[PDB]
Design a protein around this nucleic acid. Structure first.
Lengths: 63, 124, 145, 209
RNA sequence: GGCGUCUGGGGGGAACGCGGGGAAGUGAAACAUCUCAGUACCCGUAGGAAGAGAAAACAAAAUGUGAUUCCGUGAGUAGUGG
RNA sequence: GAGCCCGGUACGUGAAAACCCGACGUCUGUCUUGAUGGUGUUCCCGAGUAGCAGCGGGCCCGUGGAAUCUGCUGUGAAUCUGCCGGGACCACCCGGUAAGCCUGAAUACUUCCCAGUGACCGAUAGCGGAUUAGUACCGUGAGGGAAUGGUGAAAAGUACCCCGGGAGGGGAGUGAAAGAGUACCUGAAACCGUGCGCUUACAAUCCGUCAGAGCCCUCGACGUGUCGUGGGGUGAUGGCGUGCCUUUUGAAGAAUGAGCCUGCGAGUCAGGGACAUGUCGCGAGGUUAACCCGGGUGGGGUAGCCGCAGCGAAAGCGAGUCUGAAUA
């Protein structure tokens, strides 16, 4: 039997050229009238995932 | 490749049982109960081998102090004299001299008396 | 003369399996699992975090789509062209795959990375901006299919 | 290039063959030969061995007695692994033991095994084992004794050669194998290799091209 | 409808086929959508195999394939999902 | 422990009859009262079908923008500038010609029969069943469902005498062996005795351990018995000393489990799976899957997969790329 890649993790994370794992930030979907532009500006773009959960994420994406 | 565990297992049963001969009751017949004894038996030995050195050193002191008081000198002073006099016979042979050939022990005591200070309670 | 009894594995090849739960001398009575609990009896799933919303469910999904009709090219750098063809000559797609520069059935595009010093008449499905210059300035022709 | 002197049953040398330096002069690789010959043995071993688990034993589908009150151990079936007659818990199942070994690894093993024979002067070539169209193992035994005195030998004989093959079959230590079916395990198991001139050329022509 | 007369059925069988009906324990760390599963079981039926089969088919501008069935890949991907 | 003793094997030979495969004919049917290529119009090309609507099923697709396939209820067309498909739909282009029916080979299986194979089990294993086996036995019934293999080369299975009611035994015999006597190969442990050596009836003992008097046995040297780089068995007496496993902050624990012995009883397997780490082959390349040819483990098999360029949601660009009005 093959190993089924996790559907949710496959739709949220990415692999870059070197093998990094990136992710998007939260708190940017709704209820953002009162969030100043500084908060929203720092909340966009892909960020390398923390090394705390880098072990679990590799297991999900690769298997 | 089914393996019958008779040959491999019977080996350790013979060792404990043969080594537990002379025990009283169940501790001499059944492997389960004999093994429980061999755990204690080999723990007692390792503790008694260390304690034997202290025990035998003791018996010698009792023989030394008994003969030392027969020559009118307390044991603690007799040792203080001997250390000061430069005699370095241990306790095993000192107890041996005291029992077997008392003539030498009297000679040793007289050496200890001489090397003792004049007033042993002096703050020197 | 070697026989079947002279054949030995290379040192470090074969390593003895660690039997587990086979006596308290090695790995006894718990087999490395510790005492009671969930992980003592069976296992715990990878995507499970004790109830808290998992890292794969409290992060927004990645943006966009895939565009099924995406045309993905196979790229060979002009630097590789120089190395594989010191003399020069014509180099079509078949000539590239003969030197193992691109996959056999792919859509080749030539990219201008290295330095080209040879007279070469390439033929690829597309060319980057610098690939045109590197081919032409070195006295070559780049005709695309 | 090793020059192999060709012999005939009459004892007269016929010619010579030139073993290529590619095929018959590789440095033997013990670690590579060992992996290959283990792979063939594993493919030989057939995995016909099985035992019935707790699920496949006949019966034992009922809780033999109550959970509480009886005073005996809690038991869920009469065929559980701990019972006598119960199922086998981690038993053997029928499995295949063949393993995938790369073609380059397998071929290079044969070259190393053959190159070893050539160095020590064990490779022999013969035009034909016996007089044609009449099997006779007495003649073949006399010939083989003349060539090599060792106990075991391997004879590479062309598929269409039947008088030779059916002659040396009955011999105790002699193994006969087609030049296409040449393998590492057979080669190493032999003290000598008694090629056939038509077979030796066929083997050489197959690889050298 | 009643007669008389000729030919057929009826029941059994371990697996495999085809068409119907169709759960629950279980996983979801609860649970109803969902999964388990069109699985277990039941029904009607043949055969030595059955079913499918000779384009109201794919395809994508190539002057391409050309009945069905069965393996390997495509691929745990495109997608779908409280 | 047999190639040369037997059954056989290699290799050949054998069918009255029945059945099965072929093959050649009787026989059956069809074309020849027939074909080939040309021109311009009317008729035909599968009907309560297709299509549409309501409610469902199933397709990667959980009704979603929901195509194609299909069930039930209504509504209900055209016959070729016709109709249906090219993921709502519309136009153009392309493919096909539904509502009629048969079709072998490639494929799945083994109740049964024949010949084989095993880095499978060897009597608590392997089928539940090596023996009365789905038998004995339990249940009204559906159903549940056991235990028991081995004397010896041959039975030569102990004639005859003695004790005894018999069972059983002792002589005598067969036997290589009766430490093989139909309770029979080998014959362990728990458990049960008999004989001998040491010790024990003023004594508080997780039953041992370290010292250790006496008695008994043994091996040497030296005389009557006496020592020794000695070995054994018992142990009077002194010192020390709170079972084993689980599970606990903590158990000798008055927390749990075990009456004893012998058998049996728990990290295994599948997948080109995932990650990591050794070792081996080739190396900017590595490798085949299915399948085909070989009584084999060998040879072929380029379809695919991994590496070889990245960024971006994507169009795209490319040693750059995205954001951005920006070389910011």
């Amino acid at each position: 039997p093959k190993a089924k890649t996790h559907s949710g993790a496959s739709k949220r994370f990415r692999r870059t050229g070197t093998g990094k794992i990136v992710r998007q930030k939260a708190n940017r979907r709704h209820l953002l009238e009162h969030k100043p532009t500084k908060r929203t500006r720092r909340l966009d773009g892909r960020t390398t995932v923390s090394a705390a959960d880098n072990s679990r994420i590799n297991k999900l994406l690769n298997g | 490749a089914r393996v019958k565990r008779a040959l491999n297992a019977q080996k350790k049963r013979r060792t404990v049982l043969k080594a537990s001969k002379g025990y009283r009751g169940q501790r001499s017949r059944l492997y389960r109960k004999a093994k429980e004894q061999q755990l204690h038996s080999l723990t007692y030995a390792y503790r008694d081998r260390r304690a034997r050195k202290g025990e035998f050193r003791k018996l010698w002191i009792s023989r030394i102090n008994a003969a030392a008081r027969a020559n009118d000198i307390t044991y603690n002073r007799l040792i203080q004299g001997l250390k000061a006099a430069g005699v370095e016979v241990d306790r095993k042979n000192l107890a041996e001299l005291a029992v077997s050939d008392p003539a030498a022990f009297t000679a040793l005591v007289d050496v200890a008396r001489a090397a003792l200070p004049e007033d042993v309670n002096a703050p020197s | 003369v070697i026989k079947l009894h002279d054949l030995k594995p290379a040192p470090g090849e074969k390593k003895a399996k660690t039997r587990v739960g086979r006596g308290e001398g090695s790995k006894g009575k718990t087999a490395g699992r510790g005492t009671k609990g969930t992980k003592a009896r069976k296992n715990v799933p990878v995507m499970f975090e004790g109830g808290q919303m998992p890292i794969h469910m409290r992060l927004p999904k990645l943006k966009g789509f895939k565009n099924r009709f995406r045309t993905e090219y196979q790229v060979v750098n002009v630097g590789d062209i120089n190395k594989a063809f010191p003399q020069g000559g014509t180099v079509g797609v078949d000539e590239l795959v003969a030197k193992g520069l691109v996959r056999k059935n792919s859509l080749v595009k030539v990219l201008g990375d290295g330095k080209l010093t040879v007279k070469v008449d390439v033929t690829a499905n597309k060319f980057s901006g610098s690939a045109r210059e590197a081919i032409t300035a070195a006295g070559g022709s780049a005709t695309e299919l | 290039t090793l020059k192999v002197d060709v012999k005939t049953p009459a004892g007269k040398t016929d010619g010579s063959v030139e073993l290529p330096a590619e095929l018959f002069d590789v440095e033997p690789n013990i670690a590579l030969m060992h992996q290959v010959v283990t792979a063939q043995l594993a493919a030989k071993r057939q995995g016909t061995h099985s035992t019935k688990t707790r699920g496949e034993v006949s019966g034992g589908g009922k809780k033999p007695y109550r959970q509480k009150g009886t005073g005996r151990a809690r038991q869920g079936s009469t065929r559980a692994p701990q019972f006598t007659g119960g199922g086998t818990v981690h038993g053997p199942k029928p499995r295949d033991y063949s393993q995938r070994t790369p073609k380059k690894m397998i071929a290079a093993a044969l070259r190393g095994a053959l190159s070893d024979r050539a160095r020590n002067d064990r490779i022999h070539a013969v035009t034909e084992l016996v007089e044609g169209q009449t099997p006779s193992t007495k003649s073949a035994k006399t010939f083989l004794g003349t060539l090599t005195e060792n106990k075991k030998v391997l004879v590479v004989i062309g598929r269409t050669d039947e008088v030779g093959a059916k002659s040396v079959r009955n011999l105790p230590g002699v193994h006969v194998i087609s030049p296409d079916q040449l393998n590492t395990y057979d080669v190493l198991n032999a003290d000598d290799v008694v090629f056939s001139v038509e077979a030796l050329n066929a083997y050489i022509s197959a690889n050298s091209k």
